[PDB]
Write a protein that binds this ligand. Structure first.
Ligand code: B12
Ligand code: B12
Ligand code: B12
Ligand code: B12
Ligand code: BR
Lengths: 196, 196, 201, 199
């Protein structure tokens, strides 16, 4: 039953039953819809994995396994959203940030609203990012920070003119760090599309 | 993979919906969203139609397969993004009961960032015109598999359904479109370009 | 708060072409009340309101189409979430001339929820073709949904009698007298259809 | 058209035409099939991207974009190969190795041969990897190294007893470094499943 899908998915992953995990995920998709399954299945399982690690019950390998699975499910949804033409929004994470899920969520929410979000993958050097934005005439750059340490490593103003609009979010980011870096801060992914 | 079409058709004809669903999903993984329509859904649909037209299968078997494929397309349709802004209304001419062409058109538009509202088939023109006007629709798109429903319409019938009116499907040709006051397009890939 | 309270919001979302909003509201209803709840207390009441509003001339065919297509899509989703078990199927359709799908889809859904392999063919299946498919697949039953009475009236006495070992007819277009004339078993309760099949558990 | 697919795909990616890149990739699939498209399209384009970067013709962002696309196509094929039951083989890259494609190829070739290859993602610390292998009762661990420096940083015997069988490959690896690390070395992915089954 739905309230038990999260537990089932997590237990499936922890015993290496990818087939079973995939079926459970698909059930979640059918029940909650695309946005629903992200809010009520993907994120809760990801958090529980994190909490289990933070508590010492599993290691990085189990975490990697679950993240890779969920990244694959999200990439599927990303390609089902389609990719509109027109000036792209480049989506990535700060240098040193290897966690991808936040960035992919942001790209997904934009693409569902008809915004051409180009997900680059994580960990993009800022000069290279600036150059690509300029060449493709990107309207915005969007950064997801799960950890605060990668943002702390950046100098003041580092994000300031990557693109006409620069957005920073994720639990690793706050309004003060965004201001220091010269980015706009946003808490809700659902409002990122509206903001553009 | 070049065997997915045969497998799907045989699965449907023996009423193995579970197997047909898996095969369809394989086709999705392999060919992508637009690809599975070109390489799996439409070929199977046509083979079913041809088999019926040849007298090899009965209406019930055909219905079963068509209903399945309609359901798979509706799934993909709702997985696509839906932007805000003036909608494009998508339907079929009065008397045209076949849905898949219209659904394809709506899907290809939604993938390209166009807010295509699929109404279902068989919409009377005054009612269609009124809805377009009320919602401030930028366009109406009609899919005609049969030519007879178009033939029954008076000259100019489609001319003012919305600021732009497109007619396609194998039931339509450039001369019939001109007679009816619609713009003709053969390729769905060019419909999105024509709007943006 | 009850499911039918969301009906006005859902319908108004649909009528202004806010598909995202309509979908979200429907999904909320699903989370809160569950599938059977939302079907009985949101989907059907809204479908009827749409129909009545059309029958009264308050909305045009296009708006009605839009709403019906939306509700059909939500029901098809639930239908495919119920899964498809193995075993001899039950074929679900509507009589020739009957284009309305929702009743048939409901019947298929309630069977599938109870572990019965209900094959929904779509609507409007000729009887000899239906009989042939039932025979080939070794179907235990056929289920017919009739919203209109005229399609049933057009059929000869006994026409439904031997489509399969069991044949069930329902929908507001059907009554017990017409079912008896046609040789079908008449059935009002969707939740009791599986039980009526006399299968294990 | 086939002889033009690689150039077309690369140019599509470099101008951020994901729709066009996806179609071109699908054409490659129609021509060459699943295994074919990897040898004739995915890998050549990946290498050309790399070479173009190494030559200074594109920046990291363009490379990231193309690699992310190709990673997505490979993950698709990986999950199409299916996942059999039975004791898994864990597939990853050494600590410090962020490149994924080699590992994904290895997992794919195993899965095609009916081996349950669990791709973990890249860059797994060895104690954590050891623990997961133990928990899942994995018969083998497979590591793909494109860079040599991450292997050089590892202590002697570091890969020994991650499972009863441990394989190391990729251009970053050679037989001498594998022996030092306590892994078995191999070059050809088409032989890897057979090499795991047999002694
Ligand atoms: C999972 C998790 C991890 C995972 C991260 C990988 C993964 N699986 O995603 C792993 C295992 C790596 C991890 C470990 C650590 N992480 Co941790 N862990 C978590 C946990 C449980 C969830 C984080 C999470 O929600 N991630 C999913 C992302 C997508 O959600 P999100 O970042 O909150 O972002 C949301 C929004 O901001 C928005 N969003 C995301 N991106 C963007 C971008 C834009 C533009 C916008 C508008 C919105 C947006 O969408 C998201 C969902 O709504 C939290 C605890 C908790 N929150 O309950 C911590 C937590 C974040 N971790 C913490 C940290 C920093 C760590 C550690 C360094 C601490 C340690 N014990 O060593 C380690 C080391 C990191 C490393 N070396 O890899 C601490 C933070 C404390 C602090 N700030 O000092 C937390 C808060 C735990 C705690 N309560 O103490 N962690
Ligand atoms: C499948 C099929 C059926 C199926 C329908 C399945 C279903 N949809 O539920 C069934 C078996 C029901 C059927 C029956 C009939 N159909 Co029939 N059958 C076909 C068949 C084999 C394929 C049709 C098809 O490709 N559909 C899929 C659609 C999407 O393809 P499409 O219309 O070509 O559209 C493409 C493009 O135009 C574009 N597109 C679509 N819409 C739009 C819109 C725009 C704006 C744009 C830009 C692009 C675009 O995308 C599509 C794919 O690339 C063809 C024969 C053939 N080989 O083509 C006939 C055909 C269409 N059928 C035909 C006939 C005669 C019938 C019947 C009337 C036969 C009869 N006497 O009873 C019945 C009608 C039933 C009714 N309800 O009225 C004729 C039509 C002749 C005509 N009118 O000119 C055809 C051509 C067969 C023939 N050669 O005689 N048929
Ligand atoms: C909605 C509706 C429509 C909608 C249909 C929406 C849709 N896409 O499905 C629209 C607007 C299209 C419509 C139009 C028409 N319909 Co109308 N409308 C209705 C309405 C309001 C409700 C029908 C309904 O409840 N549908 C849902 C189904 C599932 O409900 P149900 O059949 O009662 O079934 C219940 C149970 O029997 C059970 N069930 C269903 N099937 C089965 C099977 C089994 C085995 C079991 C156990 C149980 C079961 O499930 C349901 C639970 O409540 C009624 C009037 C009313 N207030 O009831 C008419 C009504 C059915 N319509 C009617 C008419 C006349 C029409 C039109 C012909 C009007 C016209 N002039 O063109 C058209 C028909 C077009 C055509 N195809 O020929 C008449 C039918 C008269 C008759 N048949 O004798 C009605 C009764 C209105 C009237 N009093 O005049 N209609
Ligand atoms: C593509 C590439 C990149 C790409 C990576 C793209 C990507 N997303 O993977 C990019 C542009 C990022 C790149 C950059 C760098 N790379 Co580079 N580039 C290459 C290139 C052109 C090809 C590598 C390749 O083919 N990878 C794909 C994999 C699958 O191929 P493979 O490892 O040969 O594996 C084959 C087999 O071994 C088998 N296989 C793979 N794994 C396994 C496992 C097992 C068990 C088995 C049996 C078989 C097997 O499958 C493959 C055949 O189909 C080579 C140059 C060349 N001509 O080879 C370098 C090369 C690997 N790069 C190199 C360097 C130096 C770098 C950088 C460190 C440069 C720098 N920044 O200073 C960075 C890395 C930055 C970092 N630390 O993260 C060096 C490595 C030197 C060394 N290892 O001693 C090379 C050799 C170039 C050179 N001549 O200097 N590179
Ligand atoms: Br009900």
């Amino acid at each position: 039953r739905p309230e038990d899908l999260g537990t089932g998915l997590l237990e499936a992953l922890l015993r290496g039953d990818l087939a079973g995990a995939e079926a459970l995920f698909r059930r979640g998709l059918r029940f909650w819809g695309p946005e629903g399954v992200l809010e009520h299945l993907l994120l809760p399982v990801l958090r529980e994995v994190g909490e289990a690690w933070h508590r010492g019950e599993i290691g990085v390998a189990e975490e990697h396994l679950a993240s890779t699975f969920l990244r694959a499910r999200l990439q599927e949804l990303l390609d089902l959203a389609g990719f509109p033409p027109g000036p792209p929004v480049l989506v990535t994470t700060p240098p040193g940030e290897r966690h991808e899920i936040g960035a992919m969520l942001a790209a997904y929410h934009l693409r569902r609203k008809g915004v051409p979000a180009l997900y680059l993958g994580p960990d993009t050097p800022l000069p290279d990012l600036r150059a690509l934005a300029r060449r493709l005439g990107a309207g915005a750059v969007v950064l997801s920070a799960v950890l605060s340490e990668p943002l702390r490593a950046l100098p003041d103003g580092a994000l300031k003119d990557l693109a006409p609009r620069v957005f920073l979010g994720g639990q690793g980011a706050g309004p003060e760090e965004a201001r220091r870096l010269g980015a706009e801060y946003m808490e809700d992914l659902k409002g990122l599309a509206e903001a553009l």
